[PDB]
Design a protein around this ligand. Structure first.
Ligand SMILES: O=C1O[C@H](CO)[C@H](O)[C@H](O)[C@H]1O
Ligand SMILES: [Mg+2]
Ligand SMILES: [Mg+2]
Ligand code: NA
Ligand code: NA
Ligand code: NA
Ligand code: NA
Ligand code: NA
Lengths: 1015, 210
């Protein structure tokens, strides 16, 4: 029957014998346990070692497995993904389905995981009531047997499937057998851009309920105009025999204080001509001055739902955390508790580099803490309902949640092929309805989403209306079909740019500012995905935040995304390394496109995270004279855990500092008058840095946590005093092949054939391993590459434009190399042309002026052909012989920063170990640049000017040729890149050019100057 | 003190090269002990009669962004025509140059002055790579105006009819010039991207005989 009916190739069958969905249950038999959320004796975990065997197809599974353990089986941890145990390969594909597109059919070779468990059941559980099993997540479909007898079937990898085992169990030992299919008709609705895995990857549990039971409950909170009064309404449903003596009590608790209670027998109000629900009752509780829930202050109450008899005997209790909040859209604005939200959001997949798609409490907490510490207040469940614990943590720590149905059909042509087809409405409906049934009581969930990237079909319209009808308390959004369809309350585009239109046919991505005011349009706009954080990215992040702050109806967005989907593999030395698409023999695959996170898989931050934190600050600052104006962007809380530290420094040297308590009302302002600052002794630039510090620890932060900062230039005193003239004069030695300059034990050598500084000596010690030469290219970032591939060139990608123009192949031709002796210096003058196939790309004209103090002043003037693609950089590079421990600079830092991602960086004196000047992006690229640098120190060297630089043990060539960070090898000495100018990194998306015009090197003529001397 | 600032000499040296003489200068402009601008130049005069002028200017970050960064002189020559390769033919400024076209333009000198009834800076042409006037040629990438009226006279005269042609010709050649604005005329209206706020500025000119 099971193999005959092939339920996994039939979208008409999404389950067999599966129980109705409902909010989290524990069946407490003690009301105080329910109140305190203590573990329930009626809810048992089957998260232990199970038996597991892999088969290539369900037809290969022997019948004997139903009755007894396979001796070839292994003992494995559950929950798990079986790919993470090495039984078969995980597959990384983005859009293209991992199976032939032939709905509803799947491959005949369909990896089948056979799970079994021998376990004990207490006799008390079988003497009365109902024993069910709950599988929180099985990917992607499964049949269940208990003691050899078939129980049921379930689909949807991301919601719990529950089955009644009451009739199947015996006291003492029982055996479960679970046949999990990798592919099913369910796979057509699970085409998310992520690793394709399978197995029993979320909790398995047993729940005991009495025969007469709470079968469902819904909690609603409604408010008066100023939120000083609320009514809690709790609808409770029962299963079992109705009796007149049955009662429901709902009580509400604020900590240990019961603030409200109501009791009633079953029997709802009249609904229609046939009466009402005899098996339901609704309790209404009045609450005066409720403490309101928000991300800012996650005030929670406890609601306890008791099923009991009239004489006071408890049958069972259920419970939930209640957050008093109202979500509504009014006059085009998303309001929470009557105030307009600014969504500092991020998309977050459930990913662990070791455990795959199994989520654990410690990782969830780690994520939430890091999110809140970096000024996020919102999370989108891209693109499926999450592990149930996630919502509990968001309720308690305070994050706004978009809960999203497990529906993505991206690889269909056209995208809405299934979603517009009524045959697929049943399968889709369950993915929406069962999510709402599970999660509707969580205050953290503020918005429902219909799924992701499935075009716009009539099924979306049907299900949009279903949610609006069943749960008016939350807006419904959905991006498919152009982000502004009839199936969305919120304009929710993905990667729509701030100012630039992308007028794609049928589904344009308008400038977000333009989108708001299109004729007839009135809705709020919140990007479901923006600022694609793939590799060296988040260029232009500040442009979004400026627009969000200026435009009331631009209420923010969700960054794509939180964490790199890299997986751990092991090399010959047993060393773990970070792997992406194709590294498991998976083909076709989309390579590094699974790594788009603000953090690495182990939760180490990428440099981009600090840019996000800074731009998402909750305090805004202005300076006028001596006065700092602090504005609060909080809607609800006062700044009751904040002080402002200020510091004034002269080119990194502290001059004065102080602290002032912050006492700002939500949306309020505070004026802070700085004391008279003593005029600086020396020439240079005064910089003011302020930071907001939280003195006290919180649930989400340590004492001393810095939440916000800003810098301003104050007075500058330009240096007019001429340095004391040196009593030494450098000497020029002219040969046919070289111009040499000597000064004491120091020597500089200019090769007359090449026109470059080929060597420098301090004594007999060589300083260079490679000559100092111009550089106009960078090892391409993920943003420079886009979707280009050797077998499928995208001619529009920056890297392909540079390659085709010959930028990477360009050869320096010497035009001029002269030497002159001045009164106090030797002057070398050079000119080079870079050419490719008869075309002059760049001309570089330099002077080198070496004086008696041993300083070498370098002037560089570059011409760039107007018709060549704008170059990635205009700078110099060389391989230094020195390997030193520290890097010390006066400039923007301390973290990696680029021209379109430097707002977070501060100007000061920074000193880091050399290894911190390299950013270990899993896919290697140009990295570690620091901008706006006036002084750089490394070993015996000092460079002064106004430049950008990176410094590391890796050449641009190696970074360019190496596809994985673990394969990199430190080269001899230290590669230094000093740029007069560097192109933006972009990132609005990572599949098309995204570097804004103002960060492109398009000026045609460029000037910069450096001084190279001894520290 | 921008209008009051006096040039203070910091450095003036001369060097003989293989095929050239190199004059190096540095000046500071100060007002009441405050240094507003520093200008560092080299003048390279070669055997072909060309004088290459390299200018590097520092602007104190806390002084209001200056109206222009350039050079001026009063030429002895009064010539009939002005010939330039750059944006024209009409007056154009950095935030008002979209209508102008890059080409070879040739106008009478009088057309290089715009007779605004209330006199001011006027007649600039931007994006100019070559300027010709009598025996003189200037090459680079600059903005310029050229007329018989000094900036001082234009500043001091309230009506165009009271202007008098001065001896010779006043040339203003700018590496950089501030936007003119105009969103309104009663509050600052020059957009940030047209303010001279970069702190350090570089430009180069070659002066020769045509
Ligand atoms: O449009 C999208 O962009 C992302 C690219 O990394 C990712 O595929 C998301 O799941 C998808 O919604
Ligand atoms: Mg099916
Ligand atoms: Mg997709
Ligand atoms: Na806004
Ligand atoms: Na991706
Ligand atoms: Na405070
Ligand atoms: Na690479
Ligand atoms: Na005037």
């Amino acid at each position: 029957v099971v193999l005959q009916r092939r339920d996994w190739e039939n979208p008409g069958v999404t389950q067999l014998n599966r129980l109705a969905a409902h909010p989290p249950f524990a069946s407490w038999r003690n009301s105080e346990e329910a109140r305190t959320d203590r573990p329930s004796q009626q809810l048992r975990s089957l998260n232990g070692e199970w038996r597991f065997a892999w088969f290539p197809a369900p037809e290969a599974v022997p019948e004997s497995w139903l009755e007894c353990d396979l001796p070839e089986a292994d003992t494995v941890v559950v929950p798990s993904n079986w790919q993470m145990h090495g039984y078969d390969a995980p597959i990384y594909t983005n859009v293209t389905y991992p199976i032939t597109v032939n709905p509803p059919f799947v491959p005949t070779e369909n990896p089948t995981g056979c799970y079994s468990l021998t376990f004990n059941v207490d006799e008390s559980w079988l003497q009365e009531g109902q024993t069910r099993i709950i599988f929180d997540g099985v990917n992607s479909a499964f049949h269940l047997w208990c003691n050899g007898r078939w129980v049921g079937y379930g689909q949807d990898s991301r919601l719990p499937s529950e089955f009644d085992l009451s009739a199947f169990l015996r006291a003492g030992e029982n055996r479960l057998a679970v046949m999990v299919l990798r592919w099913s008709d369910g796979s057509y609705l699970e085409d998310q851009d992520m690793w394709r895995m399978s197995g029993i990857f979320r909790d398995v549990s047993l729940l005991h309920k009495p025969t007469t039971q709470i079968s469902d409950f819904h909690v609603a909170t409604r408010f008066n105009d100023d939120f000083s009064r609320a009514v809690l309404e709790a609808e409770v449903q029962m299963c079992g025999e109705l009796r007149d003596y049955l009662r429901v009590t709902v009580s509400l608790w604020q900590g240990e204080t019961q603030v409200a209670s109501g009791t009633a027998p079953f029997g709802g109000e009249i609904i229609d001509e046939r009466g009402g629900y005899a098996d339901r009752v609704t309790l209404r509780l009045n609450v005066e001055n409720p403490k309101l829930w928000s991300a800012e202050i996650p005030n929670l109450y406890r609601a306890v739902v008791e099923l009991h008899t009239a004489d006071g005997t408890l049958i069972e209790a259920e419970a939930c955390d209640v957050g008093f909040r109202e979500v509504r859209i009014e006059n085009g604005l998303l309001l929470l508790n009557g105030k307009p939200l600014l969504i500092r959001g991020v998309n977050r997949h459930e990913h662990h580099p070791l455990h795959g798609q199994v989520m654990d409490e410690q990782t969830m907490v780690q994520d939430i803490l890091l999110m809140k510490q970096n000024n996020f207040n919102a999370v989108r469940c891209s693109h499926y309902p999450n592990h149930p614990l996630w919502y509990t943590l968001c309720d308690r720590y305070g994050l706004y949640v978009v809960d999203e149905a497990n529906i993505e059909t991206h690889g269909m042509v056209p995208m809405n092929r299934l979603t517009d087809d009524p045959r697929w409405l049943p399968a889709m409906s369950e993915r929406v309805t069962r999510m709402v049934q599970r999660d509707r009581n969580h205050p953290s969930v503020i918005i429902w989403s219909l799924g992701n990237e499935s075009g716009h079909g009539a099924n979306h319209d049907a299900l949009y209306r279903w949610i609006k009808s069943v749960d008016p308390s939350r807006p419904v959004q959905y991006e498919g079909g152009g982000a502004d369809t009839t199936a969305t309350d919120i304009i929710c585009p993905m990667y729509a740019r701030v100012d630039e239109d992308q007028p794609f046919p049928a589904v344009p991505k308008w400038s977000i500012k333009k989108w708001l005011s299109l004729p007839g349009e009135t809705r709020p706009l919140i990007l479901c995905e923006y600022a694609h954080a793939m590799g060296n990215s988040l260029g232009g992040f500040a442009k979004y935040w400026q627009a969000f702050r200026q435009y009331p109806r631009l209420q923010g967005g969700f960054v794509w995304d939180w964490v790199d989907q890299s997986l751990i593999k092991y090399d010959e030395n047993g060393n773990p390394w970070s792997a992406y698409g194709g590294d498991f023999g998976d083909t076709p695959n989309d390579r590094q496109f699974c790594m788009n996170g603000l953090v690495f898989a182990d939760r180490t931050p990428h440099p981009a995270l600090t840019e996000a934190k800074h731009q998402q600050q909750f305090f805004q600052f202005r300076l006028s004279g001596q006065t700092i104006e602090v504005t609060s962007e909080y809607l609800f809380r006062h700044s009751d855990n904040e002080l402002l530290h200020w510091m004034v420094a002269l080119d990194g040297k502290p001059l004065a500092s102080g602290e002032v308590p912050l006492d700002v009302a939500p949306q309020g302002k505070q004026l802070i008058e700085l004391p008279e600052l003593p005029q600086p002794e020396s020439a240079g630039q005064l910089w003011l840095t302020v930071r907001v510090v939280q003195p006290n620890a919180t649930a989400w932060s340590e004492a001393g946590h810095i939440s916000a900062w800003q810098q301003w230039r104050l007075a500058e005193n330009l240096s007019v005093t001429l340095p004391a003239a040196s009593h030494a004069i450098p000497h020029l030695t002219t040969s046919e092949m070289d111009f040499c300059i000597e000064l004491g034990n120091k020597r500089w050598q200019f090769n007359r054939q090449s026109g470059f500084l080929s060597q420098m000596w301090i004594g007999d010690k060589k300083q260079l391993l490679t000559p100092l030469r111009d550089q106009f290219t960078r090892a391409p970032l993920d943003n420079d590459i886009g979707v280009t591939e050797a077998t499928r060139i995208d001619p529009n990608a920056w890297v392909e434009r540079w390659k085709a123009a010959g930028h990477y192949q360009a050869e320096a031709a010497l035009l001029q190399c002269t030497a002159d002796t001045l009164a106090d210096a030797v002057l070398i003058t050079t000119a080079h042309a870079w050419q490719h196939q008869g075309k002059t790309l760049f001309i570089s004209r330099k002077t080198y002026r070496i004086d008696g103090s041993g300083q070498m002043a370098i002037t560089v003037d570059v011409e760039v052909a107007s018709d060549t693609p704008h170059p990635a950089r205009i700078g110099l590079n060389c391989q230094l012989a020195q390997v030193a421990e520290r890097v010390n600079w006066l400039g923007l830092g301390p973290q990696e920063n680029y021209p379109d991602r430097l707002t977070a960086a501060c100007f000061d004196r920074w000193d880091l170990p050399l290894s911190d000047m390299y950013t270990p992006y899993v896919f290697p690229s140009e990295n570690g640049l620091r901008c706006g640098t006036r002084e750089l120190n490394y070993g015996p060297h000092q460079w002064r000017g106004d430049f950008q630089f990176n410094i590391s043990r890796y050449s641009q060539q190696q970074l360019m040729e190496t596809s994985h960070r673990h394969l990199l090898h430190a080269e001899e000495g230290t590669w230094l890149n000093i740029d007069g100018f560097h192109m933006g990194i972009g990132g609005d998306d990572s599949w098309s050019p995204s570097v804004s015009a103002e960060f492109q090197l398009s000026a045609g003529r460029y000037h910069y100057q450096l001084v190279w001397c001894q520290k």
